[PDB]
From a paper:
Similar to earlier assays of CeSAS-6N, we employed dimerization-impaired variants of these domains (C. reinhardtii SAS-6N (CrSAS-6N) F145E and HsSAS-6N F131E) to ensure that the hydrophobic cavity of the dimerization interface is solvent-exposed. To elucidate the location of A11 and A12 binding to HsSAS-6N, we assigned the NMR spectra of this domain and determined the crystallographic structure of HsSAS-6N F131E at 1.46 Å resolution. Comparison of the HsSAS-6N head domain structure to that of other resolved SAS-6 variants revealed that the human protein is most similar to CrSAS-6N and the Danio rerio SAS-6 head domain, with sub-0.7 Å root mean square deviation (RMSD) of Cα atom positions. In contrast, the HsSAS-6N structure diverged more strongly from that of CeSAS-6N (∼2.8 Å Cα RMSD), largely driven by repositioning of the α1 and α2 helices. We assigned the HsSAS-6N F131E NMR spectra and quantified the spectral changes upon addition of compounds on a per-residue basis, which allowed us to locate the most affected amino acids on the domain structure. Both A11 and A12 perturb amino acids surrounding the dimerization interface, whereas addition of other compounds did not produce a similar pattern. A12 binding involved fluctuating interactions of the methylpiperidine moiety with multiple residues of the HsSAS-6N dimerization cavity (Leu-76, Val-78, Phe-83, Lys-86, Phe-87, Leu-90, His-136, and Leu-137), compared with A11 where similar but tighter interactions were formed by the compound aromatic group. We observed the formation of two stable hydrogen bonds between the A12 sulfonyl group oxygen and the HsSAS-6N Leu-77 amide and between the A12 acetamide and the Gly-75 carbonyl atoms. As seen in MD simulations of HsSAS-6N with A12, the available hydrophobic interface in this orthologue is larger than originally thought on the basis of other SAS-6 structures, and this interface could be exploited by “growing” the methylpiperidine moiety, thereby gaining human SAS-6-specific enthalpic contributions to the interaction.
Author numbering: -1 to 149
The structure:
């Protein structure tokens, strides 16, 4: 079976945005794990998971294999390789967390759905930086509803 190493696990403030409504959820438990298998073949995956301590139905995840990361790096225009990606993402999440109490946060973590409702469609986890001139999106990840593993 795959063994997991937790690289990040904490409550994060999340702005959930649907077509006609936006809600701030403060009890979102976000984790980043490195999962590995050694036999018969050595393989590493990065798993990103969002759960909600106060809502058992809210679940999103993304599994990124070390071989699938080169596509994501290109799609997102990233400068980091697979092994450097967790620390880049964690540093952004720490900046989001440090701005949790601000009325106008400099860094925001948001989950955006193009639908009017949260459903079985993917939603986009964005890290946005705010400033007087314009908003910058540092990262967008397409998360799937549900958990990475059954139940």
């Amino acid at each position: 079976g795959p063994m997991s190493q937790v690289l990040f696990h904490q409550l994060v403030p999340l702005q959930v945005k649907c077509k006609d409504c936006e809600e701030r959820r403060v009890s979102i438990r976000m984790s980043i794990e490195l999962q590995s298998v050694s036999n018969p073949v050595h393989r590493k995956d990065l798993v990103i998971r969002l759960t909600d301590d106060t809502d058992p139905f809210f679940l999103y995840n993304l599994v990124i294999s070390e071989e699938d990361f080169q596509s994501l790096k290109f799609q997102q225009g990233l400068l980091v390789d697979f092994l450097a990606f967790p620390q880049k993402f964690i540093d952004l999440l720490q900046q989001c967390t440090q701005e949790h109490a601000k009325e106008i946060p400099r860094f925001l973590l948001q989950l955006v759905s193009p639908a009017a409702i949260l459903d079985n469609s993917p939603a986009f986890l964005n890290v946005v930086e705010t400033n007087p001139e314009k908003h910058l999106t540092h990262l967008s990840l397409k998360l799937l509803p549900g958990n990475d593993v059954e139940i």
